[PDB]
Amino acid sequence: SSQIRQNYSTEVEAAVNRLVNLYLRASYTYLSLGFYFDRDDVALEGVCHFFRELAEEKREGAERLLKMQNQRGGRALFQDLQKPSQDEWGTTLDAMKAAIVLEKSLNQALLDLHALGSAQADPHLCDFLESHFLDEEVKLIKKMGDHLTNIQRLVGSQAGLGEYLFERLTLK
Amino acid sequence: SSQIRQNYSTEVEAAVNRLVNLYLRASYTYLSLGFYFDRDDVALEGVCHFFRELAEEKREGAERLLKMQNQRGGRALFQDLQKPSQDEWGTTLDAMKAAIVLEKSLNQALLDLHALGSAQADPHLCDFLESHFLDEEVKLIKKMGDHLTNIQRLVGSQAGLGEYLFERLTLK
Amino acid sequence: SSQIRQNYSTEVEAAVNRLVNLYLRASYTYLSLGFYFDRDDVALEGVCHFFRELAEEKREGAERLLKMQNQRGGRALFQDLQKPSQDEWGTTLDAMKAAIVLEKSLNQALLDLHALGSAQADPHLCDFLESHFLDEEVKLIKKMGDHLTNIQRLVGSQAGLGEYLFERLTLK
Amino acid sequence: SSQIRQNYSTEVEAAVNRLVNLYLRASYTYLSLGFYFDRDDVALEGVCHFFRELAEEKREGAERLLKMQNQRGGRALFQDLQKPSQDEWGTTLDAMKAAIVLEKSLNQALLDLHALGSAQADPHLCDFLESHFLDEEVKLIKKMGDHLTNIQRLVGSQAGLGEYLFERLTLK
Ligand SMILES: [Ir+4]
Ligand SMILES: [Ir+4]
Ligand SMILES: [Ir+4]
Ligand SMILES: [Ir+4]
Ligand SMILES: [Ir+4]
Ligand SMILES: [Ir+4]
Ligand SMILES: [Ir+4]
Ligand SMILES: [Ir+4]
Ligand SMILES: [Ir+4]
Ligand SMILES: [Ir+4]
Ligand SMILES: [Ir+4]
Ligand SMILES: [Ir+4]
Ligand SMILES: [Ir+4]
Ligand SMILES: [Ir+4]
Ligand SMILES: [Ir+4]
Ligand SMILES: [Ir+4]
Ligand SMILES: [Ir+4]
Ligand SMILES: [Ir+4]
Ligand SMILES: [Ir+4]
Ligand SMILES: [Ir+4]
Ligand SMILES: [Ir+4]
Ligand SMILES: [Ir+4]
Ligand SMILES: [Ir+4]
Ligand SMILES: [Ir+4]
Ligand SMILES: [Pd+2]
Ligand SMILES: [Pd+2]
Ligand SMILES: [Pd+2]
Ligand SMILES: [Pd+2]
């Protein structure tokens, strides 16, 4: 058992384990999104690469959370990783919408953990969440929103042309 | 009080102070234009960056004017900076039109000061205005007109597509 | 309208817009302070340069605030920028006193926004304010206080000599 | 005789020759000022060097005027160079006052030639005077005024100390 654990509640420890599962689930979702856009009948490599890099970011998020759990003397517990919500992701517009929904859900979970850690008087936790996750989520969600606006502007008329152009001129 | 002031009328001194306020107002306008195009629901970063760089140019214009006022022994006097004319700027076409209107107004003010300094026999002033402001305004207004023509050509049919393309292929 | 806004109250959004106006007003104040010390009858270039660099810092502060407002999905709204409180700034002592008063007012506004964001449960805001504004204001105000103490020590007897010396040996 | 002279009046030609004599006289004045501050009983080497460099500037001004006179097909005519107005120049304050009086007189002569060339419709002349003389005189006279203000501030009490300090900390 730990000899280091201090000011680290069992409620926070569990919530950290839930958040690890959420980040890993999000990484898996992004893996599926990435490979969908690599299908020969979809073939938007800029979209594939955008989602694959998000898969990596989310996995790294989970790993940072796991290192933090061990730094505080908590115990990592892993659960089943639920398969992604869809097997086919539609258009780049549909996929970007799905991505923002996913990210807002991760953000809301961070906010819920921060609130819990406030109620627990755990400032190391508040700080850790702030500096490596909350600012990153805000920045990511702004980029996604920007992309969604550009996609929408493009696929008002001539949807195929607009999807190609966004991929070619925004995504790489 | 000054020991250096020579051939520098109180009328020119006041007009220089009015022009400083106009350049600063124009810088503020461009700040507002820039951030509007950075909204998640507008999201034209090439447009944001074009206007932000104009904000900087106009501030530098005012600073050069203030240094000149002190070089001649005049006294800088600052007034309220009126907020920009709009809170939302519409399309890139609308914004570019607003920009050219603004720049033509600055130009006309430079021309009016040059006329005043003629009537005052103040060639240092004529020279200073010419070399650091009048040629720059002519060049800037030509670039704006060029941009307006390209935007107009693009948004005749398929306005969203054309706005995206101008941003991507002209503005960066 | 925004597709990204999350946990970002209308009260915080408005307070951020007020703070942008305060930073810009402070930048304008510093512009006026800087050019006053560049008058031929004042002629303290170290003082001019100290205030001009603060003008730049305050403008950058406002720009960071505006980028943050857009990152959260809030809407920038600009108001009239009130001219500075004085047209002539007296001695370097008077000016430094004015500067510290100004900075303490900006600081108090940051503290008031941080309190609001506490009451709103907005940790992204707390973090953003902390890391890019609160530590900077504390450091700046300490430097100003140090300068004020040195000026005061100098202008106890032989005020002209002391003002020259501070400018020459502290300010550059 | 010239085969090139065009739009270059005998009135302008004579005024250019008078201005050459004024620049050379000013160079001579600065030579005398420089060596005075190099006396063992004055011994302000920063002041010596400031005036010696102005002697060089004024000679170069005259040489540019002479090259211009030949470029337009006018004929250089030289007159007696009147010795400087004083043989001893007093304090650094007295000398700086004398310098600004001298420079304002050169400036006024440039302005008078510019007016003449206006009345003569000679824009090459206006341009030449503007770009190589009028802006330089304005900049020089502002630096002199700044220096005068600093000297005055220093020699309010403890005149010897203040003169030493200005020389050491402003002039090199
Ligand atoms: Ir990449
Ligand atoms: Ir890559
Ligand atoms: Ir990449
Ligand atoms: Ir917290
Ligand atoms: Ir941490
Ligand atoms: Ir590109
Ligand atoms: Ir390419
Ligand atoms: Ir650029
Ligand atoms: Ir750039
Ligand atoms: Ir740029
Ligand atoms: Ir003119
Ligand atoms: Ir100039
Ligand atoms: Ir500096
Ligand atoms: Ir500097
Ligand atoms: Ir600096
Ligand atoms: Ir807080
Ligand atoms: Ir931030
Ligand atoms: Ir030198
Ligand atoms: Ir030298
Ligand atoms: Ir030198
Ligand atoms: Ir002229
Ligand atoms: Ir010339
Ligand atoms: Ir120095
Ligand atoms: Ir030295
Ligand atoms: Pd890829
Ligand atoms: Pd930008
Ligand atoms: Pd400066
Ligand atoms: Pd020398």
UniProtKB/Swiss-Prot annotation, chains A, B, C, D:
Pfam families in UniProt: Ferritin
Any Gene Ontology biological process: iron ion transport
Residues where Fe cation binds: E53, E56, E57, E60, E63
GO cellular component, one term: autophagosome
Domain Ferritin-like diiron: 6-155
Localization (cell): Cytoplasmic vesicle, Autophagosome; Cytoplasm; Autolysosome
InterPro entries in the cross-refs: Ferritin (IPR001519), Ferritin-like (IPR012347), Ferritin-like_diiron (IPR009040), Ferritin-like_SF (IPR009078), Ferritin_CS (IPR014034), Ferritin_DPS_dom (IPR008331)
Primary localization: cytoplasm
GO molecular function: ferric iron binding; ferrous iron binding; iron ion binding
Parts of the chain that traverse the membrane: none
Region annotated Catalytic site for iron oxidation, chain positions: 53-60
Source superkingdom: Eukaryota
Ranges in a coiled coil: none
Record's keyword terms, sorted: Acetylation, Cytoplasm, Cytoplasmic vesicle, Iron, Iron storage, Lysosome, Metal-binding
Modified residues (N-acetylserine): S1
Record function comment: Stores iron in a soluble, non-toxic, readily available form. Important for iron homeostasis. Iron is taken up in the ferrous form and deposited as ferric hydroxides after oxidation. Also plays a role in delivery of iron to cells. Mediates iron uptake in capsule cells of the developing kidney. Delivery to lysosomes by the cargo receptor NCOA4 for autophagic degradation and release or iron.
Other observations noted: In horse spleen the light chain is the major chain.
Family: Belongs to the ferritin family.
Assembly behavior: Oligomer of 24 subunits. There are two types of subunits: L (light) chain and H (heavy) chain. The major chain can be light or heavy, depending on the species and tissue type. The functional molecule forms a roughly spherical shell with a diameter of 12 nm and contains a central cavity into which the insoluble mineral iron core is deposited. Interacts with NCOA4.
Name under which the protein is recorded: Ferritin light chain
